Amino acid sequence: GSHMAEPQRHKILCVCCKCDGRIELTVESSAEDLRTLQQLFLSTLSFVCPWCATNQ
Amino acid sequence: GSHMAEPQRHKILCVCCKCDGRIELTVESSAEDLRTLQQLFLSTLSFVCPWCATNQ
Ligand SMILES: [Zn+2]
Ligand SMILES: [Zn+2]
């Protein structure tokens, strides 16, 4: 049916640094705050999926 | 890099916006780059774990 949505729930489809697995990073982050944090990715940051992080 | 155990693989314990549940955000960047993104979280930002992100 219909529902609301808002420019928050956004999706940086990235990869995991330790396992090169695809990660859907749903980060609930305003588009240019997402952009900003994606500049932090482009600087240094990677994500490490909670599966692989738990397995280590 | 070379060697291992580099000061990036870090953990912003936050909560899911909609599960209202503990997400240990395993995000891999230097402490103050982590911190900067944590200031985004302290401003406005949330995380939406791949479980709820998939299920909505
Ligand atoms: Zn991973
Ligand atoms: Zn959640």
Q: What characteristics describe this protein?
A:
homodimer; alpha+beta; Double Stranded RNA Binding Domain; two-stranded antiparallel ribbon; 2 helices; 3 strands; flat; binds zinc ion; Protein E7 (chains A, B)
Present the secondary structure layout.
The structure is a homodimer of 56-residue chains.
Chain A: E1 9-15, E2 22-28, H1 31-43, E3 46-47, H2 50-55
Bound molecules: zinc ion (ZN) (2 copies).
The most extensive contact between chains is:
A-B, 24 and 26 residues
Briefly note the CATH topology name of chain A.
Double Stranded RNA Binding Domain
Strand content of chain A: 25-35%
Radius of gyration of chain A, taken over Cα atoms and rounded to an integer in Å: 13 Å
Q: Give the helix/strand class of chain A.
A: alpha+beta
What is the H/E string of chain A? EEHEH
Tell me the helix content of chain A: 25-40%
Give the CA-CA distance, first to last residue of chain A: 41 Å
Bound ligands, named by name, code or SMILES: zinc ion
Helical segment tally of chain A?
2
* Large-scale geometry of chain A: flat
Largest beta-sheet details of chain A: 2 strands, antiparallel
CATH class designation of chain A:
Alpha Beta
In CATH, the architecture of chain A is 2-Layer Sandwich
PDB class: oncoprotein, virus/viral protein
Keywords: E7, dimer, HPV, oncoprotein, zinc binding, virus-viral protein complex
Assembly: dimeric
Entry title: NMR structure of the C-terminal domain (dimer) of HPV45 oncoprotein E7
